Amino acid sequence: QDPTQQLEPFLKRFLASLDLLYTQPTSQPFPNVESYATQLGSNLKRSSAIIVNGQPIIPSPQEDCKLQFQKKWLQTPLSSHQLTSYDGHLIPGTGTFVVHFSAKVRFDQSGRNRLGESARPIWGSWFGVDVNLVVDENVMQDGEIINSMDYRFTYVPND
Numbered sequence: 343q344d345p346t347q348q349l350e351p352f353l354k355r356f357l358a359s360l361d362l363l364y365t366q367p368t369s370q371p372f373p374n375v376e377s378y379a380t381q382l383g384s385n386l387k388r389s390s391a392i393i394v395n396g397q398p399i400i401p402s403p404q405e406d407c408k409l410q411f412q413k414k415w416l417q418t419p420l421s422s423h424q425l426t427s428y429d430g431h432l433i434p435g436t437g438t439f440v441v442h443f444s445a446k447v448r449f450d451q452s453g454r455n456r457l458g459e460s461a462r463p464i465w466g467s468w469f470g471v472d473v474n475l476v477v478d479e480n481v482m483q484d485g486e487i488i489n490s491m492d493y494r495f496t497y498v499p500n501d
Contacts, residue, residue: 345439346430352385352481353443356488357423359384360415364457373457379416383491385477386411391490411491419450420463423471432479438489441475444496470497 364378386392386408392399394414399407428443450463474492481487 345432348482349428349430349441350425352477353425353428353441355484356383356385356475357425357445361421361423363420375416375457378457379412382412382415383408383488385484385486386488386491387486390488393492393494395494416456418456419452419454420456421447421449422463422465423447433476437479438476439479439481441477443473443475445471445473447471467499467501468497469495469499472496 359381360383362378362381366373388406388408389401390407392407392411394411399410399414401407402410405413423445424447425443425445428441430439430441432439446468448465448468451466452462452464453460454463472494474490475488476490478487478489
C-alpha cells in the first residue's frame, strides 16, 4: 500500500496515453501523424521488451520495439480503458517493480480512425485486458521508465 501510493496515478497516466484523442492545432493545416503516434505509450523505453497478445515485438535494424508498438497501436480505433484492479511489488536489488493490472477496454465503432478519417465516438462492447509491466522505481517521472510490457486481451467480444 505504502510504496504503491504512486502506483494508481501512474497506471492511469499510462492508460490515458493509449486512449489519447487526436487534436489538430489550428496553426497546423495538415495532420501530424508522427507527433500523435509518438505520445502513445510514451512511458515505454525505446528498448523495452513488448509482447502483444502473446506475440513479442522483435527489434529491427530500422525500428525499435517502442516505435513498432506505436505504429501497431495507432491502427486501432480510439480506445477507452477503465482500470479495475492492480498489484505491484518491488523486486529486491533491481531498482524495478513488477506491476500486474486488469482493465476493461472498448473501442470506437464509428468507422473513424484515430486521426478522425473515414474512407462523436460510439463505444463498442467491453474487452478484458491483463497487463504486466516491469518499471523503473521512480514512477512519478513521466519519462521512459517501462522496461517491459505484456499486453493481452483476456476476453474478446464476438461482435
